[PDB]
């Protein structure tokens, strides 16, 4: 049933982030618990994901690092922490990460 | 999605549920496990006061059956 695999997706998200602790970390940091393919990771700790089944605008996102340039960014994240090379791929100026 | 609106509704449902559950449980706690006596008219009040006297104790929710007779 299509109604049961909805619950299955809601469960594979809990395991997708590596257990309850990882699931709650992303929920309280990004307010989104989706799971997507990992496209890469930059030298500052940022991880960049991809899910082409999502509508345009939500098919790419980044989970910011918890420490950049000696600053604690667990809660205080910023849109300017994306380095220039990933800035182009994140805003869909190109399809090439 | 839309189902993310339910957690807010759930809290409202629980909050509105407590007032009706609390009164029902408190009434059964204060009337010997029975519904609180309804007395809208003086006839129903006269019987309630009578049961208070017949109770022996000064309470109208203590009922006396066919054991006070003879």
């Amino acid at each position: 049933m299509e109604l049961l695999q909805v619950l299955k997706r809601g469960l594979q998200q809990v395991s997708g982030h590596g257990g309850l602790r990882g699931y709650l970390r992303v929920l309280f940091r990004a307010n989104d618990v989706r799971v997507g393919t990992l496209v890469g990771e930059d030298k500052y700790g940022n991880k960049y994901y991809e899910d082409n089944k999502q509508f345009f605008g939500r098919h790419r996102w980044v989970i910011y690092t918890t420490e950049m340039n000696g600053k604690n960014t667990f809660w205080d994240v910023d849109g300017s922490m994306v380095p220039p090379e990933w800035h182009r791929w994140l805003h869909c100026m190109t399809d090439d990460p | 999605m839309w189902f993310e609106v339910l957690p807010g509704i759930a809290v409202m449902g629980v909050c509105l549920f407590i007032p009706g559950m609390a009164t029902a449980r408190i009434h059964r706690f204060s009337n010997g496990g029975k519904e609180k006596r309804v007395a809208h008219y003086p006839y129903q009040w006269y019987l309630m006061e009578r049961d208070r006297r017949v109770s022996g104790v000064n309470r109208s929710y203590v009922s006396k059956g066919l054991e006070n007779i003879d």
Binding site: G57, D76, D78, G79 | -
Partner: protein, 156 residues
């Protein structure tokens, strides 16, 4: 522990509340107001940050000056700012409110709303994209999160 520790956690409680319920009073004067409407539109949905779409001046915490402030409109702007209950913050949106922009050398333009009211965040662009304005609102939230109102009181 020390008294500063306790007073420094009450500060985080009030700072959390104030930066999580920013109610803006938008001064939509010119083209920049169209981008402000696009920040309330579905794609960015400012309301999901706790920033209601529009509030009356008496209920407002932040004033967004979005457009060209002219000499004729200046006194009316300072009156709305004086009637705002505190704490009150001001956000300057676009080049016109920053330094006059394209009309800097006009006879009927105030060269920056900072000449009339104090400003907390300057947002550059003509117009700033709705994403840049959102980035400027989130930067005001961090500015409210660094406030030390109670620490200053305790050490007075």
């Amino acid at each position: 522990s020390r008294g500063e520790y306790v007073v420094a956690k009450l500060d985080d409680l009030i700072n959390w509340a104030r930066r999580s319920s920013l109610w803006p009073m938008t001064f939509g004067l010119a083209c920049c107001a169209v981008e402000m409407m696009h920040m309330a539109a579905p794609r960015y949905d400012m309301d999901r940050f706790g920033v209601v779409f529009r509030a009356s001046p008496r209920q407002s915490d932040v004033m967004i000056v979005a457009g060209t402030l002219t000499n004729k409109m200046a006194p009316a702007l300072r009156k709305v700012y004086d009637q705002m209950p505190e704490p009150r913050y001001v956000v300057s949106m676009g080049s016109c409110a920053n330094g006059g922009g394209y009309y800097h050398y006009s006879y009927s333009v105030v060269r920056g709303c900072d000449r009339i009211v104090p400003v907390d965040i300057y947002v550059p662009g003509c117009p700033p994209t709705a994403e840049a304005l959102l980035y400027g609102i989130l930067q005001l939230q961090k500015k409210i999160k660094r406030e030390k109102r109670l620490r200053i009181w305790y050490r007075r």
